[PDB]
């Protein structure tokens, strides 16, 4: 029985506060990971076992400053468990909706102001999302479901790149089998292929959702609507908070043919540097 060492974690150790989400995501307490210490656990056949037992395995490799950081599992008795670190502000999608100008209520935090995030910061976010994809794309890893709702935000504004999923999102995806057509490229949708340039085209589309504070792409649109859109080459406008360099990153993500769109190491790079000095 070959493989990665999983760290396994006694069910003793596990203190489960309340559910955060629905796979279906606790909030925990975890000794002695260190002292005492707040985590994420996330509970589930033996062919789950197996899909289980590889994705631990898996989620064991992609260990990454922007990977949110997996500790273990739980395997003595069911429900079979995962245990991640706490990511305090929760998935990215709602955080940008309650920084938002749309939002209803405001936002406490010893950590951010509430209101509408700096260009300084929503650039900071898009850097970090990239960095994550740059290590998985670095792996050969194809993530099929890149966006705002499957990154994870932290203190201080740590962004990192999760998982699926809550039910409030069924919206994102179109029963075919669910897709997330709304960021799938033309070769996905046409043709059903999936490569780190389709994440490459997901990703502009994280961007879109980053600078219009969490909104659906295509939000006016029915999902064959959508498919339509995309198919026929027409692209989500740029948002009234994000600068032409920006826009430009965007639509370099977009082209139609996977091989003319930049890398992600490039489109990285370009958020870094637009990120460490903010144009006006
Ligand atoms: N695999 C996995 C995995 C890894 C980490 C976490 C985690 C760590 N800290 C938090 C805080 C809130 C939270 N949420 C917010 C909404 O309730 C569901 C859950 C979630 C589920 C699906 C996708 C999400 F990005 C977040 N998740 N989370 C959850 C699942």
Not at 20 to 26: A, C, D, R
Not at 127 to 150: E, I, K, P
Request: aromatic share 8%.
């Amino acid at each position: 029985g070959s493989g990665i060492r999983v760290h396994h974690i006694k069910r003793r150790d596990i203190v489960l506060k309340w559910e955060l989400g629905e796979g279906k995501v606790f909030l925990a307490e975890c000794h002695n990971l260190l002292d005492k210490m707040l985590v994420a656990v996330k509970a589930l056949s033996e062919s789950a076992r197996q899909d289980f037992q590889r994705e631990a395995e898996l989620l064991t490799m992609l260990q990454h400053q922007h990977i949110v950081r997996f500790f273990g599992v739980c395997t003595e008795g069911r429900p079979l468990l995962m245990v991640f670190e706490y990511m305090r502000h929760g998935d990215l999608n709602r955080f940008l909706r309650s920084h938002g100008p749309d939002a209803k209520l405001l936002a406490g935090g010893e950590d951010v102001a509430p209101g509408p995030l700096g260009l300084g910061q929503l650039l900071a976010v898009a850097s970090q999302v990239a960095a994550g994809m740059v290590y998985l794309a670095g792996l050969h890893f194809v993530h099929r479901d890149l966006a705002t709702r499957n990154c994870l935000v932290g203190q201080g504004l740590v962004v990192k790149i999760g998982d699926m999923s809550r039910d409030i999102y069924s919206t994102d995806y179109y029963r075919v089998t669910m897709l997330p057509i709304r960021w799938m490229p033309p070769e996905s949708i046409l043709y059903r292929k999936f490569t780190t340039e389709s994440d490459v085209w997901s990703f502009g589309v994280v961007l879109w959702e980053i600078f219009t504070y969490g909104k659906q792409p295509w939000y006016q649109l029915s999902n064959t609507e959508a498919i339509d859109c995309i198919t026929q080459g027409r692209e989500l406008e740029r948002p009234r908070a994000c600068p032409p360099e920006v826009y430009a990153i965007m639509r370099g993500c977009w082209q139609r043919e996977p091989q003319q769109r930049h890398s992600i190491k490039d489109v990285h790079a370009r958020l870094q540097a637009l990120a460490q000095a903010p144009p006006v």
